[PDB]
Design a protein around this ligand. Structure first.
Ligand SMILES: CCCCCCCC/C=C/CCCCCCCC(=O)OC[C@H](O)CO
Ligand SMILES: CCCCCCCC/C=C/CCCCCCCC(=O)OC[C@H](O)CO
Ligand SMILES: CCCCCCCC/C=C/CCCCCCCC(=O)OC[C@H](O)CO
Ligand SMILES: CCCCCCCC/C=C/CCCCCCCC(=O)OC[C@H](O)CO
Ligand SMILES: CCCCCCCC/C=C/CCCCCCCC(=O)OC[C@H](O)CO
Ligand SMILES: CCCCCCCC/C=C/CCCCCCCC(=O)OC[C@H](O)CO
Ligand SMILES: CCCCCCCCCCCCCCC
Ligand SMILES: CCCCCCCCCCCCCCC
Ligand SMILES: CCCCCCCCCCCCCCC
Ligand SMILES: CCCCCCCCCCCCCCC
Lengths: 97, 97
């Protein structure tokens, strides 16, 4: 399986950066929630973003404990992004699932 | 830092399960997109879920390559969940960012 190996090996020095992509990718979602499409906030699941926040927090603690920035750097940024999603969903819906 | 250590150590045997939580947590978000609140799909960022899908796919390939189910199992389920988000956003908006 040359392709799987090629990609797998190529990702090795990029793993810390990889952890930053999804948190950074959440910025357009935050933009829609807070700025451009707040009237559609009810379409967002509070449950989903709460659990994202929870898991990101756990990985952050894990990574900090083991002095592994590849883990905690991306997940710390993630945690903040997903908490911002939680706050915004509550702010524009008054509460939902 | 006893608390950080306590949590960090406790998570060690749970890391595979941890990888399943966010994908499973996406189910209420998929429910809102497809079933209960499709009229608010424009509030979802296609860019965000596309990039989630992309990163999940990369981790899946990485985990498969290194025979590490703690990595690829959760990210494979994630990949499918986030692709489902992508498809649904396109289906109910006709395209957006
Ligand atoms: C605590 C964390 C909070 C901080 C993170 C929240 C970031 C919110 C904005 C991200 C910009 C990404 C989307 C780009 C928005 C560009 C705005 C603009 O240029 O105008 C609208 C544009 O035309 C669109 O169609
Ligand atoms: C007072 C603000 C201090 C922020 C430091 C928090 C530290 C924890 C990080 C959470 C990131 C997201 C924080 C939430 C961003 C606030 C957005 C907000 O509440 O806006 C509501 C809306 O504008 C009205 O309807
Ligand atoms: C364990 C990881 C998860 C941690 C999660 C951290 C966020 C906790 C919630 C903060 C809500 C603050 C939002 C304030 C919204 C402004 C007030 C408003 O507009 O109405 C909302 C009203 O309070 C309807 O309950
Ligand atoms: C390819 C991946 C696609 C498959 C994954 C997509 C899952 C979509 C539904 C998840 C259920 C979670 C939300 C629970 C919905 C319960 C429905 C119900 O009981 O009624 C509505 C309820 O009252 C609500 O308020
Ligand atoms: C024909 C279906 C076969 C599915 C196998 C795909 C394999 C890849 C996994 C992607 C998971 C999400 C797949 C997307 C689920 C389809 C939902 C859909 O298209 O619904 C549109 C809407 O109902 C109309 O407006
Ligand atoms: C690299 C990881 C990312 C991979 C991402 C995989 C998904 C690719 C998009 C499939 C769209 C299919 C959706 C079909 C929607 C039904 C038709 C419709 O309702 O209008 C949409 C129309 O095509 C407006 O473009
Ligand atoms: C493994 C997590 C699956 C999440 C499915 C639960 C959806 C129903 C909502 C109840 C939980 C809401 C409280 C926020 C955690
Ligand atoms: C003006 C409207 C005010 C809306 C509330 C602003 C304060 C929200 C702070 C959330 C902080 C969450 C981090 C724990
Ligand atoms: C590191 C990723 C940041 C994402 C910010 C880009 C938002 C603007 C939309 C352009 C990209 C849309 C194409 C889908 C990948
Ligand atoms: C009835 C409306 C049909 C809407 C399209 C259904 C097919 C979508 C398939 C998406 C598969 C994506 C995985 C690559």
């Amino acid at each position: 399986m040359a392709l799987i190996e090629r990609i797998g090996k190529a990702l090795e020095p990029l793993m810390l950066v990889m952890g930053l992509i999804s948190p950074l990718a959440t910025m357009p979602q935050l933009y829609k929630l807070y700025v451009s499409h707040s009237e559609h906030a009810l379409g967002l699941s509070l449950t989903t973003w709460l659990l994202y926040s929870f898991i990101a927090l756990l990985w952050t603690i894990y990574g900090i404990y083991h002095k592994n920035p590849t883990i905690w750097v991306g997940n710390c940024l993630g945690f903040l992004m997903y908490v911002a999603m939680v706050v915004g969903i509550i702010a524009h819906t008054g509460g939902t699932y």
